[PDB]
Amino acid sequence: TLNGGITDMLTELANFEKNVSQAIHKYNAYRKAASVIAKYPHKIKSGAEAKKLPGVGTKIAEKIDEFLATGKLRKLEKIRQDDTSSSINFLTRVSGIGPSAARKFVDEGIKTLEDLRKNEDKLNHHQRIGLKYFGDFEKRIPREEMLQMQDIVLNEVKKVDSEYIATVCGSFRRGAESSGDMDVLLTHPSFTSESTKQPKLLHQVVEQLQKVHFITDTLSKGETKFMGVCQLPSKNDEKEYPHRRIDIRLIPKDQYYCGVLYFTGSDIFNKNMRAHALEKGFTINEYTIRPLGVTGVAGEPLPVDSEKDIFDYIQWKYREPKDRSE
DNA sequence: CCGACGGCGCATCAGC
DNA sequence: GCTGATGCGCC
DNA sequence: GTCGG
Ligand SMILES: [Cl-]
Ligand SMILES: [Cl-]
Ligand SMILES: [Mg+2]
Ligand code: NA
Ligand code: NA
Ligand code: NA
Ligand code: NA
C-alpha cells in the first residue's frame, strides 16, 4: 500500500481517541482521513499534498510532515509508553469490552490477559465469550473459508424454509480476499415493513445452525439481530479451524436493498454516503431512504427497487460493492 | 466562529 | 414491569 | 479533527 505508513499512524491515533480519550468524533475524523489517504493513488510527499484531500486538515498535515521527515510520531511514541493507555488499548481488543469497561477494569487492577482469565466472574456474557476466543477473533478469514461458510449457512437456511433468502454481506460481498467475520443478511416473505406474519423467524435459523454445530456460542440475540460465534467443521485428524464471529440481520423483505446497502458497507463508506445524503436533503438507514422536510424532519420512505436507486436519490453515480471498501 | 458529524440492535442499569 | 440513558456492537 | 455556513 502506497501510504501504509501514514494510514497506520492515523489508525493508531484513531484507536487512541476512541479507546483512551473516549472522543468518538476525533476517532471518526482520523479514520476518515486514513481512508481518504488509503485510496489516494500517489505516494504522498508532504502534509500539504495530503491536506488537499477531504478529511485531512491542518493538524493531520503537520503529523504527516513529522512522519515523513522521521518515520515516526512523537505523540504516538509517548502514547505507546503510557502504561494506562497501553492497558486500556489492550483490554478493548476483547469483544464486549469497550473504553468504559476497560478503564474500569484497569481501576480494579485487571489489565492483562492473565488477569482477565482469573476474573471471569467479573465479566458479562458477551465479554466472557470474547475472552474465550481472544486469539481466534483477531485472525482473518480466508475468502476460501468464507465460501465454505456461505455454503453451510445458505444450505441450512434452505432446510428450515425454502423461502428464506440469506445473503453474505460485509467485506465478503465487496470481494475481499479475507474477512474479519461473516455477515449474513436474512429475509423471509413473512416479515415485511407491513407485518410480522411469523414469529421466531431468526430463532429458527439460529437454532438450525446450532443443531449442526456451526454456531457454537451467542454474544447477543434479539428478534432481528444475532451476534455470535461459528466454526467450520474440520476433517479427521486435522487441526480445528479457528472460531469466527458471525452476525445475522433479519430485515423486512421489502426493504432488502436498503438493508443490503447497509450491511455491505464498508463502515466508512456508509458514514460518508449517509453524510452526503444529509447534505442532499435525505436520511438513509438500513430500512429506508426518506426526504428531509423543511423543519429538518424525516418524511415518508421513498420507493426503492434496487441498490442503484438509493445512489440516484443522492446524486451519486453507482458504486459496485468492490469499490466501497473505504 | 461553531454546530454537526450515520444510524440503529441488544444488554444493562437507574428511576419510577 | 416500563421507559430512557448509556455501553458496545454492526456496516 | 475537519468541514461548511
Ligand atoms: Cl470528539
Ligand atoms: Cl425507517
Ligand atoms: Mg464483517
Ligand atoms: Na483537506
Ligand atoms: Na472491544
Ligand atoms: Na460483522
Ligand atoms: Na458536515
Short mmCIF file of C-alpha atoms (C1' of nucleotides) and ligand atoms in Angstrom, two decimals:
data_model
loop_
_atom_site.label_atom_id
_atom_site.label_comp_id
_atom_site.label_asym_id
_atom_site.label_seq_id
_atom_site.Cartn_x
_atom_site.Cartn_y
_atom_site.Cartn_z
CA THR A 1 0.00 0.00 0.00
CA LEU A 2 1.38 3.34 -1.19
CA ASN A 3 0.91 5.27 2.02
CA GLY A 4 0.69 2.42 4.51
CA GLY A 5 2.93 4.17 7.00
CA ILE A 6 0.72 7.22 7.19
CA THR A 7 -2.54 5.29 7.28
CA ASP A 8 -1.30 3.06 10.10
CA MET A 9 -0.29 6.18 12.05
CA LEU A 10 -3.71 7.70 11.64
CA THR A 11 -5.44 4.44 12.54
CA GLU A 12 -3.35 4.18 15.69
CA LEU A 13 -4.33 7.73 16.58
CA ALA A 14 -7.99 6.99 15.92
CA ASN A 15 -7.87 3.97 18.23
CA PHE A 16 -6.30 6.09 20.96
CA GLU A 17 -9.01 8.73 20.71
CA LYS A 18 -11.77 6.11 20.79
CA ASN A 19 -10.34 3.77 23.43
CA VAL A 20 -8.44 6.08 25.80
CA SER A 21 -9.67 9.62 25.18
CA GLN A 22 -13.24 8.47 24.54
CA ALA A 23 -13.54 11.10 21.81
CA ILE A 24 -15.73 9.50 19.17
CA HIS A 25 -15.61 12.42 16.72
CA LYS A 26 -11.82 12.51 16.80
CA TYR A 27 -11.89 8.76 16.22
CA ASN A 28 -14.15 9.20 13.19
CA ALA A 29 -12.04 12.13 11.94
CA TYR A 30 -8.84 10.11 11.99
CA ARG A 31 -10.47 7.14 10.27
CA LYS A 32 -12.00 9.32 7.56
CA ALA A 33 -8.54 10.79 6.90
CA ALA A 34 -6.89 7.37 6.88
CA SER A 35 -9.47 6.11 4.42
CA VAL A 36 -9.16 9.05 2.02
CA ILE A 37 -5.37 8.74 2.11
CA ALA A 38 -5.57 4.97 1.63
CA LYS A 39 -7.36 5.36 -1.71
CA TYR A 40 -5.19 8.28 -2.88
CA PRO A 41 -3.26 6.82 -5.82
CA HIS A 42 0.05 8.66 -5.28
CA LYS A 43 2.79 8.21 -2.70
CA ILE A 44 2.31 11.32 -0.55
CA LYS A 45 5.33 13.68 -0.49
CA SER A 46 4.17 16.28 2.04
CA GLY A 47 1.48 17.21 4.53
CA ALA A 48 0.35 19.99 2.19
CA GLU A 49 -0.23 17.47 -0.60
CA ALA A 50 -2.31 15.45 1.87
CA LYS A 51 -4.22 18.49 3.09
CA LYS A 52 -5.76 18.80 -0.38
CA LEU A 53 -7.83 15.69 0.43
CA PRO A 54 -11.27 15.96 2.10
CA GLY A 55 -10.90 14.91 5.72
CA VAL A 56 -7.25 15.90 6.11
CA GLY A 57 -6.82 19.22 7.89
CA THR A 58 -4.04 21.32 9.41
CA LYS A 59 -3.24 19.08 12.38
CA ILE A 60 -3.01 15.88 10.34
CA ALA A 61 -0.95 17.65 7.70
CA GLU A 62 1.56 18.56 10.41
CA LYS A 63 1.68 14.98 11.70
CA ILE A 64 2.17 13.73 8.15
CA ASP A 65 5.13 16.11 7.74
CA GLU A 66 6.66 14.87 11.02
CA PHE A 67 6.09 11.25 9.97
CA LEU A 68 7.62 11.72 6.53
CA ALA A 69 10.62 13.50 7.99
CA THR A 70 11.42 10.98 10.72
CA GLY A 71 9.41 7.81 10.12
CA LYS A 72 7.51 8.25 13.39
CA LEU A 73 5.24 10.39 15.53
CA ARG A 74 6.46 11.55 18.94
CA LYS A 75 2.84 11.83 20.10
CA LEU A 76 2.44 8.12 19.39
CA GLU A 77 5.85 7.21 20.79
CA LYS A 78 4.68 8.71 24.08
CA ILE A 79 1.25 7.09 23.96
CA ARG A 80 2.97 3.74 23.39
CA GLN A 81 4.82 4.27 26.67
CA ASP A 82 1.85 5.23 28.82
CA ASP A 83 1.06 2.10 30.83
CA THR A 84 -2.54 3.14 31.45
CA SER A 85 -3.12 3.94 27.78
CA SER A 86 -1.47 0.62 26.84
CA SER A 87 -3.60 -1.40 29.23
CA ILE A 88 -6.81 0.27 28.10
CA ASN A 89 -5.98 -0.29 24.46
CA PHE A 90 -5.28 -3.96 25.09
CA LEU A 91 -8.46 -4.60 27.06
CA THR A 92 -10.66 -3.06 24.37
CA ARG A 93 -9.42 -5.76 21.98
CA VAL A 94 -11.72 -8.18 23.82
CA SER A 95 -15.17 -8.24 22.21
CA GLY A 96 -17.62 -6.72 24.67
CA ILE A 97 -15.03 -4.64 26.47
CA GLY A 98 -15.25 -1.02 25.34
CA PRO A 99 -13.48 2.17 26.51
CA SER A 100 -15.60 2.49 29.65
CA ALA A 101 -15.28 -1.12 30.80
CA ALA A 102 -11.56 -1.15 30.03
CA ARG A 103 -10.83 1.90 32.17
CA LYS A 104 -12.98 0.37 34.93
CA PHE A 105 -11.09 -2.94 34.83
CA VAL A 106 -7.75 -1.15 34.95
CA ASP A 107 -9.03 0.73 38.02
CA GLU A 108 -9.59 -2.65 39.69
CA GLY A 109 -6.14 -3.91 38.77
CA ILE A 110 -7.40 -6.06 35.92
CA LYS A 111 -5.17 -5.25 32.95
CA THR A 112 -3.69 -8.36 31.37
CA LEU A 113 -4.94 -11.50 29.67
CA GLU A 114 -3.90 -13.39 32.79
CA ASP A 115 -5.95 -11.01 34.97
CA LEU A 116 -8.99 -11.39 32.78
CA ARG A 117 -8.72 -15.16 32.87
CA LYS A 118 -8.86 -15.33 36.65
CA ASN A 119 -11.67 -12.82 36.90
CA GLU A 120 -14.20 -14.43 34.56
CA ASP A 121 -16.92 -13.84 37.13
CA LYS A 122 -16.35 -10.11 36.68
CA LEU A 123 -17.32 -10.37 33.00
CA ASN A 124 -20.76 -10.21 31.44
CA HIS A 125 -21.68 -12.97 28.98
CA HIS A 126 -20.52 -11.19 25.85
CA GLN A 127 -17.16 -10.36 27.44
CA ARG A 128 -16.71 -13.94 28.68
CA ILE A 129 -17.05 -15.33 25.15
CA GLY A 130 -14.87 -12.54 23.73
CA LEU A 131 -12.18 -13.61 26.18
CA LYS A 132 -12.68 -17.31 25.41
CA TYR A 133 -11.85 -16.68 21.73
CA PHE A 134 -9.49 -13.71 22.08
CA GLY A 135 -6.82 -15.15 19.81
CA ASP A 136 -9.20 -16.57 17.22
CA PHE A 137 -11.16 -13.33 16.81
CA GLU A 138 -8.05 -11.44 15.77
CA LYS A 139 -7.36 -13.83 12.92
CA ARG A 140 -8.67 -13.02 9.44
CA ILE A 141 -10.83 -15.44 7.45
CA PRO A 142 -9.50 -16.53 4.06
CA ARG A 143 -12.05 -16.00 1.31
CA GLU A 144 -11.82 -19.75 0.68
CA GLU A 145 -13.18 -20.47 4.16
CA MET A 146 -15.80 -17.73 3.74
CA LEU A 147 -17.00 -19.66 0.69
CA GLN A 148 -17.31 -22.86 2.73
CA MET A 149 -19.12 -20.93 5.46
CA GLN A 150 -21.51 -19.41 2.90
CA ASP A 151 -22.36 -22.85 1.56
CA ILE A 152 -23.22 -24.17 5.02
CA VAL A 153 -25.33 -21.17 6.02
CA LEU A 154 -27.25 -20.95 2.75
CA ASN A 155 -27.97 -24.69 2.72
CA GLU A 156 -29.04 -24.88 6.36
CA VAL A 157 -31.27 -21.87 5.89
CA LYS A 158 -32.87 -23.57 2.88
CA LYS A 159 -33.53 -26.67 5.00
CA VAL A 160 -35.51 -24.63 7.52
CA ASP A 161 -37.69 -22.84 4.92
CA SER A 162 -37.01 -22.63 1.20
CA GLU A 163 -38.48 -19.12 1.20
CA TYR A 164 -35.66 -17.66 3.29
CA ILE A 165 -33.02 -15.76 1.36
CA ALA A 166 -29.61 -15.45 3.02
CA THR A 167 -27.04 -13.08 1.58
CA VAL A 168 -23.43 -12.82 2.75
CA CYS A 169 -22.54 -9.14 3.00
CA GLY A 170 -19.72 -7.22 4.67
CA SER A 171 -16.23 -7.37 3.19
CA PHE A 172 -17.14 -10.71 1.56
CA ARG A 173 -19.66 -9.04 -0.77
CA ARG A 174 -17.10 -6.32 -1.54
CA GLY A 175 -14.90 -9.12 -2.85
CA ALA A 176 -12.20 -9.06 -0.16
CA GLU A 177 -9.61 -11.87 -0.25
CA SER A 178 -10.03 -12.07 3.51
CA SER A 179 -12.67 -11.04 6.03
CA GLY A 180 -12.71 -10.25 9.74
CA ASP A 181 -16.02 -12.09 10.21
CA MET A 182 -19.15 -13.34 8.45
CA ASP A 183 -22.10 -11.02 7.89
CA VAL A 184 -25.39 -12.58 6.88
CA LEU A 185 -28.45 -10.66 5.76
CA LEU A 186 -31.63 -12.70 6.03
CA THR A 187 -35.07 -12.16 4.58
CA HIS A 188 -38.33 -14.08 4.66
CA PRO A 189 -41.60 -13.12 2.95
CA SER A 190 -43.47 -13.40 6.27
CA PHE A 191 -41.55 -10.40 7.61
CA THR A 192 -42.14 -7.10 5.82
CA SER A 193 -42.44 -3.46 6.86
CA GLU A 194 -46.19 -4.04 6.93
CA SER A 195 -46.43 -7.17 9.05
CA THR A 196 -44.76 -9.92 11.03
CA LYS A 197 -46.80 -12.93 9.93
CA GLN A 198 -44.37 -15.34 11.57
CA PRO A 199 -42.62 -15.39 14.97
CA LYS A 200 -39.17 -16.83 15.66
CA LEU A 201 -38.02 -16.27 12.09
CA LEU A 202 -34.47 -15.50 13.22
CA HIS A 203 -34.57 -18.01 16.08
CA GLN A 204 -35.43 -20.94 13.79
CA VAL A 205 -32.38 -20.17 11.69
CA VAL A 206 -30.05 -19.72 14.67
CA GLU A 207 -31.38 -22.96 16.17
CA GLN A 208 -30.73 -24.93 12.96
CA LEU A 209 -27.16 -23.62 12.69
CA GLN A 210 -26.61 -24.61 16.32
CA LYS A 211 -28.03 -28.05 15.65
CA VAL A 212 -25.37 -28.74 13.02
CA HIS A 213 -22.70 -27.34 15.34
CA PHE A 214 -21.94 -24.41 13.07
CA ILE A 215 -22.97 -21.75 15.60
CA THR A 216 -21.06 -22.51 18.81
CA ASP A 217 -21.79 -19.52 21.07
CA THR A 218 -24.06 -16.49 21.34
CA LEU A 219 -22.94 -12.96 22.21
CA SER A 220 -26.38 -11.39 21.97
CA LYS A 221 -29.64 -12.26 20.30
CA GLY A 222 -32.93 -10.50 19.63
CA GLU A 223 -35.82 -10.70 17.18
CA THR A 224 -33.81 -9.21 14.29
CA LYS A 225 -30.10 -9.34 15.13
CA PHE A 226 -27.94 -12.26 16.17
CA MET A 227 -24.32 -11.75 17.24
CA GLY A 228 -22.34 -14.92 17.89
CA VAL A 229 -19.65 -17.42 17.09
CA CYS A 230 -19.34 -20.14 14.46
CA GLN A 231 -16.85 -22.76 13.26
CA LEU A 232 -16.20 -24.75 10.12
CA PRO A 233 -16.06 -28.48 10.65
CA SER A 234 -12.60 -29.99 10.29
CA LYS A 235 -11.67 -33.37 8.79
CA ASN A 236 -10.41 -36.47 10.57
CA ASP A 237 -7.04 -35.91 12.24
CA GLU A 238 -6.76 -32.28 11.23
CA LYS A 239 -6.41 -29.24 13.49
CA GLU A 240 -9.65 -27.40 14.12
CA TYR A 241 -10.39 -24.15 12.29
CA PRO A 242 -10.38 -21.02 14.42
CA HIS A 243 -13.70 -19.93 15.88
CA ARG A 244 -15.21 -16.99 13.92
CA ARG A 245 -17.57 -14.13 14.62
CA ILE A 246 -20.90 -14.25 12.80
CA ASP A 247 -23.59 -11.58 12.64
CA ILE A 248 -27.03 -12.26 11.25
CA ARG A 249 -29.51 -9.48 10.50
CA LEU A 250 -33.15 -10.16 9.62
CA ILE A 251 -34.50 -7.28 7.52
CA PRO A 252 -38.05 -6.73 6.27
CA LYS A 253 -38.09 -8.28 2.79
CA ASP A 254 -39.49 -5.23 1.03
CA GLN A 255 -36.56 -3.25 2.47
CA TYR A 256 -33.87 -5.57 1.13
CA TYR A 257 -31.95 -3.01 -0.94
CA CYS A 258 -31.51 -0.51 1.90
CA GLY A 259 -30.62 -3.48 4.10
CA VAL A 260 -28.00 -4.85 1.73
CA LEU A 261 -26.51 -1.41 1.13
CA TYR A 262 -26.08 -1.01 4.90
CA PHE A 263 -24.68 -4.48 5.56
CA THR A 264 -22.32 -4.34 2.60
CA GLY A 265 -20.53 -1.26 3.96
CA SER A 266 -17.76 -0.56 4.50
CA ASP A 267 -18.46 1.34 7.71
CA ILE A 268 -16.66 4.44 6.46
CA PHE A 269 -18.41 4.15 3.08
CA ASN A 270 -21.72 4.17 4.94
CA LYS A 271 -20.85 7.18 7.09
CA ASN A 272 -19.62 9.03 4.03
CA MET A 273 -22.68 8.09 1.94
CA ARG A 274 -25.13 8.89 4.74
CA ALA A 275 -23.47 12.28 5.40
CA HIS A 276 -23.74 13.08 1.68
CA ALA A 277 -27.40 12.05 1.87
CA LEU A 278 -27.91 14.58 4.65
CA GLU A 279 -26.29 17.29 2.51
CA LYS A 280 -28.59 16.34 -0.36
CA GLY A 281 -31.57 16.53 1.99
CA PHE A 282 -32.21 12.82 2.65
CA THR A 283 -31.65 10.41 5.51
CA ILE A 284 -30.64 6.79 4.91
CA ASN A 285 -30.81 3.88 7.35
CA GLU A 286 -30.87 0.10 6.80
CA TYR A 287 -34.62 0.20 6.08
CA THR A 288 -35.41 3.26 4.03
CA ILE A 289 -34.32 6.47 2.43
CA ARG A 290 -36.51 9.42 3.37
CA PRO A 291 -36.56 13.08 2.36
CA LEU A 292 -35.82 15.74 4.94
CA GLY A 293 -38.69 18.21 5.29
CA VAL A 294 -38.12 21.95 5.74
CA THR A 295 -38.09 21.75 9.54
CA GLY A 296 -35.50 19.02 9.13
CA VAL A 297 -37.89 16.18 9.90
CA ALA A 298 -37.76 12.84 8.09
CA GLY A 299 -40.55 12.43 5.58
CA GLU A 300 -42.05 9.18 4.28
CA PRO A 301 -40.00 6.35 2.72
CA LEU A 302 -39.13 6.85 -0.93
CA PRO A 303 -39.66 3.95 -3.34
CA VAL A 304 -36.51 1.87 -3.83
CA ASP A 305 -36.30 -1.02 -6.27
CA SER A 306 -32.54 -1.51 -6.39
CA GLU A 307 -29.33 -0.51 -4.69
CA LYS A 308 -28.75 1.90 -7.55
CA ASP A 309 -31.99 3.78 -6.81
CA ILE A 310 -30.55 4.84 -3.48
CA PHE A 311 -27.41 6.25 -5.13
CA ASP A 312 -29.59 8.08 -7.69
CA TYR A 313 -31.56 9.89 -4.97
CA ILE A 314 -28.41 11.46 -3.57
CA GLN A 315 -26.93 12.21 -7.00
CA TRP A 316 -24.04 9.76 -6.76
CA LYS A 317 -23.01 7.55 -9.64
CA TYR A 318 -23.48 3.89 -8.69
CA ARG A 319 -20.59 2.13 -7.00
CA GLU A 320 -20.24 -1.64 -7.10
CA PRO A 321 -19.59 -3.37 -3.76
CA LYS A 322 -15.93 -3.93 -4.67
CA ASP A 323 -15.49 -0.16 -4.88
CA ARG A 324 -16.96 0.58 -1.43
CA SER A 325 -14.05 -0.70 0.66
CA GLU A 326 -13.30 2.65 2.27
"C1'" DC B 1 -16.58 31.08 14.84
"C1'" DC B 2 -19.14 26.99 15.99
"C1'" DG B 3 -22.68 23.32 15.43
"C1'" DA B 4 -22.64 18.98 13.21
"C1'" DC B 5 -20.52 14.88 12.50
"C1'" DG B 6 -24.77 7.96 10.49
"C1'" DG B 7 -27.96 5.26 12.12
"C1'" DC B 8 -29.64 1.70 14.90
"C1'" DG B 9 -29.97 -3.52 17.56
"C1'" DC B 10 -29.21 -5.75 22.09
"C1'" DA B 11 -27.66 -5.69 27.08
"C1'" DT B 12 -27.56 -3.37 31.29
"C1'" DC B 13 -28.92 -0.14 34.59
"C1'" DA B 14 -31.36 3.78 37.05
"C1'" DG B 15 -35.50 5.62 38.33
"C1'" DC B 16 -40.36 5.20 38.87
"C1'" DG C 1 -42.67 -4.12 34.70
"C1'" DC C 2 -41.72 0.06 31.78
"C1'" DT C 3 -39.00 3.76 29.64
"C1'" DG C 4 -34.93 6.34 28.77
"C1'" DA C 5 -29.77 6.63 29.05
"C1'" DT C 6 -25.73 4.51 28.11
"C1'" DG C 7 -22.26 1.00 26.57
"C1'" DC C 8 -20.96 -1.72 22.94
"C1'" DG C 9 -21.60 -3.80 18.78
"C1'" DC C 10 -22.59 -3.99 13.42
"C1'" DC C 11 -21.91 -1.93 8.47
"C1'" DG D 1 -10.09 16.87 13.95
"C1'" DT D 2 -12.37 18.71 9.88
"C1'" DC D 3 -15.89 20.71 7.43
"C1'" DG D 4 -19.33 24.18 5.85
"C1'" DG D 5 -22.32 28.04 6.53
CL CL E 1 -14.85 14.05 19.90
CL CL E 2 -37.31 3.74 8.76
MG MG E 3 -17.80 -8.16 8.56
NA NA E 4 -8.30 18.80 3.17
NA NA E 5 -13.87 -4.43 22.40
NA NA E 6 -19.86 -8.49 11.42
NA NA E 7 -20.66 18.43 7.93
#
